[PDB]
Amino acid sequence: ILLGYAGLMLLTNVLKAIGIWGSWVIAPVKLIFAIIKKLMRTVSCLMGKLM
């Protein structure tokens, strides 16, 4: 019972602590990077079509 309560307290402390914002910061970086790469590719295609 003591080990279970200690584990529950550790889980609650981890949930309350602001330290989970790692994925929601790492993944959007590469997501918007790929988005900007696609935008640059579309801009190059538009410039080629205009030429």
């Binding site: 910061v25 959007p28 970086v29 918007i32 990077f33 988005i35 900007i36």
Partner: peptide, 9 residues
């Protein structure tokens, strides 16, 4: 990396 993220987001 921080500057790239600031430019991207």
């Amino acid at each position: 990396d921080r500057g790239r993220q600031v430019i991207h987001e």
